[PDB]
Amino acid sequence: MIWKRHLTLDELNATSDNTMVAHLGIVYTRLGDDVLEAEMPVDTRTHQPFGLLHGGASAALAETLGSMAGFMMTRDGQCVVGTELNATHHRPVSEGKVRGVCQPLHLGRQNQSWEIVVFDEQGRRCCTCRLGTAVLG
Amino acid sequence: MIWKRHLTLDELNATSDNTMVAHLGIVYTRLGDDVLEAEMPVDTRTHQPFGLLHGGASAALAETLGSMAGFMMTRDGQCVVGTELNATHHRPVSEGKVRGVCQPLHLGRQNQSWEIVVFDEQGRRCCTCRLGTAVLG
Numbered sequence: 424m425i426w427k428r429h430l431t432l433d434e435l436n437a438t439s440d441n442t443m444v445a446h447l448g449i450v451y452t453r454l455g456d457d458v459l460e461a462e463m464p465v466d467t468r469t470h471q472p473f474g475l476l477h478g479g480a481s482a483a484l485a486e487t488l489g490s491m492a493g494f495m496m497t498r499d500g501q502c503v504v505g506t507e508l509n510a511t512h513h514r515p516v517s518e519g520k521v522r523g524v525c526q527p528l529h530l531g532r533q534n535q536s537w538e539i540v541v542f543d544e545q546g547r548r549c550c551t552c553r554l555g556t557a558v559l560g
Numbered sequence: 561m562i563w564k565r566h567l568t569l570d571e572l573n574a575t576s577d578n579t580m581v582a583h584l585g586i587v588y589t590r591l592g593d594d595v596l597e598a599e600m601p602v603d604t605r606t607h608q609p610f611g612l613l614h615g616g617a618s619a620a621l622a623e624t625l626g627s628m629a630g631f632m633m634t635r636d637g638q639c640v641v642g643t644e645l646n647a648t649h650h651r652p653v654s655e656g657k658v659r660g661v662c663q664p665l666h667l668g669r670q671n672q673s674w675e676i677v678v679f680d681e682q683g684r685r686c687c688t689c690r691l692g693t694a695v696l697g
């Protein structure tokens with residue numbers, strides 16, 4: 424069980440208040456031993472002008488998940504910031520909700536690397552991301 | 561101009577209606593020969609839980625600009641999709657607005673590559689992004 428800082432899904436979801444996370448309708452849906460998951464709507468809040476899920480929404484869902492997972496891997500007075508994000512958009516999404524699933528690749532003392540995969544409502548992989556973070560303080 | 565479609569600023573801003581672009585308060589501020597710029601507020605819509613600009617918001621700004629640049633490289637029967645995104649978060653921002661500036665790196669007939677730099681109000685570079693797009697059809 425990797426987490427060093429322990430939050431419930433309720434506490435996690437309350438962190439989203441007055442942030443972009445809540446603004447995109449992102450809701451954390453699962454906290455496992457080594458996995459964090461959230462759902463995100465595919466609607467006007469996350470669409471691009473031609474009816475698809477905006478690639479920037481999948482990206483934001485990935486930085487959200489990687490950064491909060493990173494947060495739960497630190498101790499009080501420590502902050503986690505995203506430093507490097509990349510994403511590959513494999514398949515379009517036109518409707519439903521997507522699920523982001525975040526797992527650790529590398530858990531360092533000052534740097535972390537997180538994998539976030541985004542799946543559509545049929546369970547198909549639509550985006551693979553990797554987020555590098557810095558642990559500060 | 562490099563663009564295939566000769567659009568106007570008013571036209572670009574009209575595409576944002578009912579999409580993530582409007583939801584994040586992104587506004588196109590400059591459409592030049594070879595450059596597309598937009599501004600984005602740093603507020604609760606684009607914040608992360610600890611008061612900073614969410615890195616996913618810079619990413620979303622970058623994918624917005626590069627894909628709309630790619631759209632302007634399409635013919636009528638065609639569409640644009642973002643395929644690869646990467647971003648480096650150099651500096652945090654907490655208030656005011658940031659400005660994204662998009663310029664072409666490579667304009668192929670299948671694929672394109674765009675640079676998007678995001679600046680704070682003092683003109684300090686806060687994020688550097690690169691976006692691959694695909695023209696389909």
Ligand SMILES: CC(C)(COP(=O)(O)OP(=O)(O)OC[C@H]1O[C@@H](n2cnc3c(N)ncnc32)[C@H](O)[C@@H]1OP(=O)(O)O)[C@@H](O)C(=O)NCCC(=O)NCCSCC(=O)c1ccccc1
Pocket residue numbers: 471472473475476477478479512513514515516623624627628631640641642643694696
């Ligand atoms: C087309 C790509 C790039 C390469 O193709 P590939 O390597 O050969 O992959 P495959 O073709 O093998 O499988 C892919 C599926 O595409 C399907 N299909 C295509 N056309 C049609 C059609 N007419 N009818 C039916 N189906 C069609 C295929 O059949 C296939 O479906 P399937 O699995 O059932 O066989 C593909 O990887 C992709 O779509 N990535 C997601 C990009 C993305 O969503 N980026 C984010 C949004 S855009 C940026 C943005 O946010 C933005 C912001 C502001 C403004 C503007 C924008």
Ligand SMILES: CC(C)(COP(=O)(O)OP(=O)(O)OC[C@H]1O[C@@H](n2cnc3c(N)ncnc32)[C@H](O)[C@@H]1OP(=O)(O)O)[C@@H](O)C(=O)NCCC(=O)NCCSCC(=O)c1ccccc1
Pocket residue numbers: 444486487488490491503504505506557559608609612613614615616649650651652653654
């Ligand atoms: C800390 C990094 C990674 C390295 O350090 P470094 O390269 O050695 O840094 P320096 O040696 O140059 O010295 C510091 C400089 O930075 C400035 N500054 C410093 N402190 C503050 C401050 N408190 N307040 C304001 N400004 C501050 C100083 O002015 C100073 O510059 P200078 O001396 O020239 O005046 C740095 O590159 C960075 O902050 N990147 C942006 C990361 C980012 O924002 N990612 C996105 C958000 S987090 C993820 C997320 O979205 C998320 C989502 C959901 C949940 C959770 C999260």
